[PDB]
Design a protein around this ligand. Structure first.
Ligand SMILES: NC(=[NH2+])NCCC[C@H](N)C(=O)O
Length: 271
């Protein structure tokens, strides 16, 4: 069974600016359109996986972005500790959901930021965990995660403020494929990626797709769900065996997130 956690946009707005996509967008989201877009995404994901919901909290508009609730492996979750006070109030609500749903929760020190699956994505065969740092999660959190979850952690440094979470520019896929935007990473981190993923398994995104959040994609088996995709990228994905489903998420891009950011896979098998 594959299960994905989402959180509906009952209280969604753009109320502050903590990433560059939010600049100029305060109160520019339409709550009604956001509901419509989220409902279409929810339906599309539910066609591929079970969807669980956590009740949203008023005053925490970014709670829709459940990718940042924590990092799940098996029965364990490393709870996120947000870098910004504007999201720290989500933490007790996410903790309560994990506890109520049978997970055993690990908490980092309150001074050590780490933003969950948004910044840390497993290689889909379970060989290691790719973990971003540079804007939200601290590099020093990576050894904690490695030990708590008994996984090798491969740290990747983000260098572009637009691509401030790993999942905005990097997406492990089924079959060992990796969908990513190399310019979001420094040279050393690109070499680290390249050492592990050979060219035939790389699906390299160009900037025009990256800025439409193409890497912020939900992949269940051979299905990939995203906001918008160029024909060029759709054909590359089709050639690699994936079926692309697009669903519009413009109201969430105003807050710096798209399809993947609105999801957390809570069934991450031990392999
Ligand atoms: N996993 C993600 N890409 N999350 C996007 C979160 C967007 C939210 N406004 C923030 O700045 O934190």
């Amino acid at each position: 069974d594959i299960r994905i956690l989402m959180c509906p946009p009952d209280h969604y707005d753009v109320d502050y600016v903590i990433n560059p996509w939010m600049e100029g967008n305060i109160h520019k989201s339409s709550q009604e359109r956001a509901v419509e877009q989220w409902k279409k995404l929810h339906q599309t994901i539910k066609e591929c996986a079970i969807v669980d919901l956590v009740k949203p909290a008023k005053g925490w508009p970014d709670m829709v972005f459940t990718a940042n609730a924590g990092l799940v492996l098996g029965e364990n979750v490393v709870l996120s500790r947000f870098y910004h006070k504007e999201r720290q109030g989500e933490e007790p609500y996410f903790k309560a959901w994990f506890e109520e749903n049978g997970f055993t929760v690990y908490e980092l020190p309150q001074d050590l930021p780490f933003e969950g699956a948004g910044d840390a994505l497993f290689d889909r065969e379970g060989r290691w965990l790719w973990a971003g740092y540079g804007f939200r999660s601290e590099l020093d959190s990576h050894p904690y995660i490695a030990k708590w979850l008994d996984t090798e952690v491969v740290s990747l440094r983000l260098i572009d403020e637009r691509f401030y979470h790993l999942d905005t520019c990097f997406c492990p896929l089924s079959g060992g494929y990796l969908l990513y935007y190399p310019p979001a990473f420094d040279a050393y981190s690109n070499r680290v990626i390249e050492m592990r993923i050979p060219p035939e398994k790389r699906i390299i995104v160009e900037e025009l797709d990256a800025v439409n959040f193409a890497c912020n994609a939900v992949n269940v088996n051979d299905i990939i769900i995203m906001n918008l995709v160029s024909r060029t990228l759709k054909e590359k994905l089709a050639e690699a065996g994936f079926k692309v489903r697009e669903t519009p998420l413009t109201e969430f891009l105003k807050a710096g997130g798209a399809a993947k950011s609105l999801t957390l896979r809570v069934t991450e098998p031990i392999l």
